[PDB]
Amino acid sequence: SERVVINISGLRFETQLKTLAQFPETLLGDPKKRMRYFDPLRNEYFFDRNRPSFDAILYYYQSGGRLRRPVNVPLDIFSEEIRFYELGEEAMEMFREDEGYIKEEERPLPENEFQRQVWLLF
Amino acid sequence: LQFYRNLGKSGLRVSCLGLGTWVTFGGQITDEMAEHLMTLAYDNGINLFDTAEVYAAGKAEVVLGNIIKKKGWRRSSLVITTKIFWGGKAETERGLSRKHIIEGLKASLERLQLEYVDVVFANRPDPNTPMEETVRAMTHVINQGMAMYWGTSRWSSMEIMEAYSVARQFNLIPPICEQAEYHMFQREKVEVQLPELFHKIGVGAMTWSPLACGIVSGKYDSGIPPYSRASLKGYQWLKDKILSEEGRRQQAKLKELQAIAERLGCTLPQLAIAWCLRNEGVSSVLLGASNAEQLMENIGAIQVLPKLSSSIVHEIDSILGNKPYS
Amino acid sequence: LQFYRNLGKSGLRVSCLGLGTWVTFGGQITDEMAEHLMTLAYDNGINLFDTAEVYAAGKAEVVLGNIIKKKGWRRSSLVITTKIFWGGKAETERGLSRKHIIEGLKASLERLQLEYVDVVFANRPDPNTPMEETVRAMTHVINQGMAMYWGTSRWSSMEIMEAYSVARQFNLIPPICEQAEYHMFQREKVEVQLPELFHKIGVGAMTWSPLACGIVSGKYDSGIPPYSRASLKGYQWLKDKILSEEGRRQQAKLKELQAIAERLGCTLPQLAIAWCLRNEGVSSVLLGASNAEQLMENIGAIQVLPKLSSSIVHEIDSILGNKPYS
Amino acid sequence: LQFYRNLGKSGLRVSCLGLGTWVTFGGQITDEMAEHLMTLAYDNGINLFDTAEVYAAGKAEVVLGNIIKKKGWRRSSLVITTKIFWGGKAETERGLSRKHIIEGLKASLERLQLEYVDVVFANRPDPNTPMEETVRAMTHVINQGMAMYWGTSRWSSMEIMEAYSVARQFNLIPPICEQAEYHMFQREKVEVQLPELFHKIGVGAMTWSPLACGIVSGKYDSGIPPYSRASLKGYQWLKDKILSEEGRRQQAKLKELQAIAERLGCTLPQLAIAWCLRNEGVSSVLLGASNAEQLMENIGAIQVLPKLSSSIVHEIDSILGNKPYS
Ligand SMILES: NC(=O)c1ccc[n+]([C@@H]2O[C@H](COP(=O)([O-])OP(=O)(O)OC[C@H]3O[C@@H](n4cnc5c(N)ncnc54)[C@H](OP(=O)(O)O)[C@@H]3O)[C@@H](O)[C@H]2O)c1
Ligand SMILES: NC(=O)c1ccc[n+]([C@@H]2O[C@H](COP(=O)([O-])OP(=O)(O)OC[C@H]3O[C@@H](n4cnc5c(N)ncnc54)[C@H](OP(=O)(O)O)[C@@H]3O)[C@@H](O)[C@H]2O)c1
Ligand SMILES: NC(=O)c1ccc[n+]([C@@H]2O[C@H](COP(=O)([O-])OP(=O)(O)OC[C@H]3O[C@@H](n4cnc5c(N)ncnc54)[C@H](OP(=O)(O)O)[C@@H]3O)[C@@H](O)[C@H]2O)c1
């Protein structure tokens, strides 16, 4: 249960190492990935980033999956953080669903050359 | 390449090779030979000498101390280290409690005839003493000027990280080194677990028994030679390993490595030692030597170090087939 | 079961039985007998000896010290503890102020002819000194190497928690032990209040007067024997308790326990002592003995400990009918 | 104006002029002359004397110490400072590791025959030792009473700020001074980088070589005089600079400044020295002198200080044409 201290622009966060280890592919869950942010003088990881977002990132580990955007945090900012902490695409997708968005389709005339050519005027 | 290295990330500079005193000093060899060995080492740039309260029940410290006093070498050109844990038969004379760390070091310093050691090590972990008590005591003897730095020995990385963590919490001094066993047939800890600690909290490794007590030298290809360590009274455990099933297996692999040695143009011991020094996480390697011939030959491991290329190392891994999992 | 226990959760290992010096050393018994007692104890594995500046006005410390010096026992195999509070008639010679703690310990160490004690205790709470001043002074004498650890005596759990709390706030050293009175007719504090502290902050208990000064031995079934403590000049208070109404009541219950003793195959004192050791929160029990016969018999309490089953203990509670409320 | 200044923002008051011992003591001049120089300085209110373990391989410290001991001056009326870094040929005898800082200062104090120095300086930055190890060691020797304060020398403002920062983080003692080179042809660091540090964290500057080893004195207008420093065996580097292309250029500008000197009614050295003292960030200026004539003349720089008006300074900048960019 070795504890881990995460300092976000001065805002102090603490959790257990097994809590982060729950998601091995994320930034905070990968020893080789967070190594770069460790301050050996203060025994903490320091990130010069957005404060309001982190409660949510951390809770994602603690809750075991729940990734909710804080009511007071813009969606453009929070998604940038989700990407930075490398929570992965599977989580971002589910996050974006619950946030509202969701969709995507199309696909021009498969080869055709001329089929996919006309199918662009009608 | 560099003969002198920093011990971990501290400012203390040690020769990549040091000379220890287990078995030999006050034991297997004579005081005159011990003196001959240290002089040879010192005159060759080696500035690191390791001992322990437990070695020959404090006898090795006395011999080491008599030499330093007799030769008149400047204390500032030496790096003396001693380990603490087993200091007597009484219940209170063993462990990492504050009482034993202070009493133990005071008694070692007395036998060594020194005002202080450069690094005092906890010889092993102590399940019975809170980490805080141990870190505070190490810090106390350092602030008392009885030691310059402190380190661990045979501790897991979990334990070493704990000592570091407790040090930061209470504003104490963190350990700078871990004395771990390291040789061709013992690689897990040094190669898998300590590297993260070296990059994360500056802890360096000072490895011991690079020839596995002689096994990796090749002197046991046939049987147990006369006057060898495996033959000495009290080292039956060692003799068993060599004649063991696993023992024969190691001796067979040693014959395969014997070819890698000639390809590199060196002796087997020089290769075995230079091998331990290939990784940067290893600050220094503590050598053992029952006589001047061995020491002179072993110091030659330094010219082999530059030859340890990726290819040779991968080939040596093939022969050993014991490369640790990442 | 285990003869040696950790004092609370510290790394200091003490024998589950210790020998104290109140009344006897420099007082009731002769210096030769005191020497005989300590030798017997030491030769039986007991490594804990307790004294106090107030005992026989510093006389007990001198006798204890002369023995340690005369027998030449290694200091590292001993655990000497001394209590500080009443050190003189002057206004500034009593209490837990920084001045008296440093002056008191320095004077005790002088009488003891020792460089340091293993544990220095505040003999009792001091309503007139801020907890910070006391915790800082205990910490100062420990960093000065005059003591290895410190503890409290007769403090409430509120007070002990306060000392611990102040220690963490200022980065000082927390106490590790509380010397509390504990015996079949005094159980509240040790059984109800200290267990939480032992699990919460590692404070262990070192209990005193396990035979209630002799009362629980059974030597007072009839009246006040010649040469007993209750008879000695200066212990009238003790004689009164024994002849008290409550006194007779206790003596009656002792006759009932006398049966539990024979069922377990031991003497009453051995049962009374082994009883105090049944709970894990009790690190050690300090014994009193006016002669070698008593000590030899009392040390036998250790073979009784394994027999103290749930049933026997519940039966002993029935007889006593003073089991403390949870 | 004020003869005595605070060193940075500390409570230590130093004379705006101090006398150093590089080259001269135990070297260029005789012990009797050194004594004559210090007496003159001391009798003139100068209370600051600077030395270093490296000066004449510890010889200057001995001479300085013999004088202080011979003259019987009260230690409390003196401000002795010494620098640590190069202390021997061994690998472990140089640098800012804890081992060398403690060993180095202990050896200097020994040669100086003093219990402590007022300020110990790290002679230069040490890329091989963690700032924490250095700050802790400086703090340790100060708490041991071997030094009263500590400072840096030849450190960048980044490094000085780092030492201060680490000091606050671990509750250690921050440096109070930086010994930087400062003279008419070396102005960047003192005038551009240190002022922010003086106002921000109280670090003051104690500048050295105000006459650029003699260059700025004007004694080299023609060629290399006999018995001058540029002529001495071992100072070929200095001779080269003076005869250099840049050397001739400086000598030409010195002839232009020679006019500013007469306008102010003083000698060139007095102007060069008084110039260094014009800015408040400069606490004191360490003087060099191979004989009593030079010292007497140089101390006169103090009467010139009041005359250094905006105009004169802007004119001196015109002649030098090396005013550093803000
Ligand atoms: N827990 C710890 O911290 C710990 C534990 C053990 C050791 N250490 C340190 O490490 C040192 C010991 O290393 P080690 O002695 O155990 O393994 P080595 O691998 O250091 O052992 C050397 C011993 O093996 C034999 N040997 C060495 N070089 C040889 C050569 N070129 N040719 C033939 N034989 C050779 C020697 O003669 P013989 O075979 O005739 O005896 C010698 O006594 C000690 O000084 C100690 O300070 C630390
Ligand atoms: N505030 C404190 O911290 C504090 C206070 C008091 C004591 N203590 C410690 O605890 C120790 C004292 O415990 P204690 O002496 O008060 O109670 P005990 O229960 O320790 O008292 C023993 C005394 O009772 C009698 N006795 C003991 N064993 C006997 C036996 N087997 N048969 C017959 N009689 C026996 C003895 O002879 P006699 O009856 O002839 O005298 C002896 O002097 C001291 O050494 C002291 O260090 C600490
Ligand atoms: N890294 C450091 O921390 C560091 C480095 C260097 C120096 N320092 C300190 O600063 C001091 C040295 O300053 P410095 O000696 O290098 O430059 P100065 O500018 O202090 O040099 C004075 C030297 O130049 C010549 N000189 C001085 N006054 C003169 C005058 N009025 N007329 C003619 N010639 C004169 C002298 O005679 P000569 O020309 O005949 O020799 C003298 O030896 C040392 O004591 C040292 O403690 C510190």
Which CATH number characterizes residue D135's domain? 3.20.20.100
Q: Which two tokens stand for residue B195?
A: 């590297």
CA distances from C149 to A121, B97, B99, B162, C5 (A): 90, 11, 9, 22, 16
Residue nearest to atom 4 of ligand 1 (CA): B208
Do the Cβ atoms of C13 and B91 come within 8 Å? yes
3-state secondary structure of C302: helix
- Which chains have 3+ CB pairs within 8 A of B? A, C, D
The vertex-C249 CA angle with C243 and C251, nearest 5°, equals 75
Domains: count for chain C: 1
Q: Say if residues B313 and B320 touch (Cβ distance below 8 Å).
A: no
Q: Say if residues B267 and B300 touch (Cβ distance below 8 Å).
A: yes
Identify residue C40 by its one-letter amino acid code. L
Going by DSSP bridges, is the β-strand pair A44-47/A38-39 parallel, antiparallel, or unpaired? antiparallel
| C154 pocket-lining for ligand 2 (C-beta < 6 Å) | yes
Cα gap A42→D301, rounded to integer Å: 49
CA distances from C243 to A115, C211, C220, C223, D39 (A): 119, 17, 9, 8, 86
Residue nearest to atom 40 of ligand 3 (CA): D228
Find, among B273, B197, B188, the residue nearest to B9 by Cα.
Answer: B197
Cα gap D56→D21, rounded to integer Å: 9
Give the number of residues written for chain D: 326
CATH of the domain at A59: 3.30.710.10
Alpha helices in C44-145 (DSSP H): 59-71, 98-112, 131-143
Pocket test for ligand 1, best of B17, B46, B185, B294 (most atoms within 8 A of CB): B294
Identify residue A20 by its one-letter amino acid code. L
Give the number of residues written for chain A: 122
Going by DSSP bridges, is the β-strand pair C282-287/D4-6 parallel, antiparallel, or unpaired? unpaired
Which residues does ligand 1 sit against, CB inside 6 Å? B 20-22, 24, 50, 83, 153-154, 179, 208-211, 213-214, 217, 219, 227-229, 269, 286-290, 294, 297-298
CA distances from A120 to A107, A112, A114, A115, B247 (A): 11, 12, 10, 9, 78
Residue nearest to atom 22 of ligand 3 (CA): D288
Q: Spell out where chain C has E strands.
A: 4-6, 13-15, 17-20, 48-52, 79-84, 117-122, 147-153, 177-179, 204-208, 282-287
CA distances from B146 to B119, B137, C125, C215, D51 (A): 9, 11, 35, 50, 28
Q: Say if residues A63 and A91 touch (Cβ distance below 8 Å).
A: no
* Candidate from D87, D103, D126 with C-beta closest to B11: D126
Which residue in chain A is spatially nearest to D166 when comparing CA positions?
Answer: A41
Task: Give the ligand whose atoms come closest to the C-alpha of residue D179.
Answer: 3
Q: Say if residues D207 and D182 touch (Cβ distance below 8 Å).
A: yes
Q: How far is the CA of D323 from the centre of ligand 3 (A)?
A: 23
Alpha helices in B25-149 (DSSP H): 31-43, 59-71, 98-112, 131-143
Is D164 within any annotated ligand binding site? Answer: no
Give the number of residues written for chain B: 326
Q: How far is the CA of C18 from the centre of ligand 2 (A)?
A: 11
Cα gap C91→C78, rounded to integer Å: 34
Cα gap D126→B203, rounded to integer Å: 19
Q: Which two tokens stand for residue B242?
A: 């060599």
Q: Which domain holds residue A6?
A: 1-101
Please count the other Cβ atoms lying within 10 Å of the Cβ belonging to residue D237.
Answer: 9
Atom of ligand 1 nearest to the CA of B50: 47
Q: Can you spell out the DSSP letters for D176-191?
A: -EEE-B-BTTB-HIII
Q: Across the strands, what pairs with C152?
A: C122, C178
Quick one: angle between helices D157-170 and D194-201, nearest 10?
20
Residues of B in contact with A38 (CB under 8 A): 200
Task: Give the ligand whose atoms come closest to the C-alpha of residue C25.
Answer: 2
Q: Which domain holds residue B115?
A: 1-326
| D152 pocket-lining for ligand 3 (C-beta < 6 Å) | no
Q: Can you spell out the DSSP letters for A56-115?
A: HHHHHHHHTS-----TTS-HHHHHHHHHHTT--HHHHHHHHHHTS---------SS-SSH
Longest CA pairwise span in chain C (Å): 56
CA distances from C60 to C24, C34, C148 (A): 8, 10, 21
Cα gap B324→B194, rounded to integer Å: 13
3-state secondary structure of B204: strand
Do the Cβ atoms of C76 and B103 come within 8 Å? yes
Please tell me which residue in C4, C42, C55, C164 is annotated as part of the active site: C55
Pocket test for ligand 2, best of C181, C229, C282, C296 (most atoms within 8 A of CB): C229
Residue positions of B annotated with a catalytic role: 55
Residues of B in contact with A40 (CB under 8 A): 200-202
The secondary structure of residue C189, as a DSSP letter, is I
Burial class, D314, CB count within 10 angstroms (exposed 0-12 / middle 13-18 / buried 19+): exposed
Residues of D in contact with B149 (CB under 8 A): 98
What's the gap in Å between the CA of B127 and the closest CA on chain C?
Answer: 9
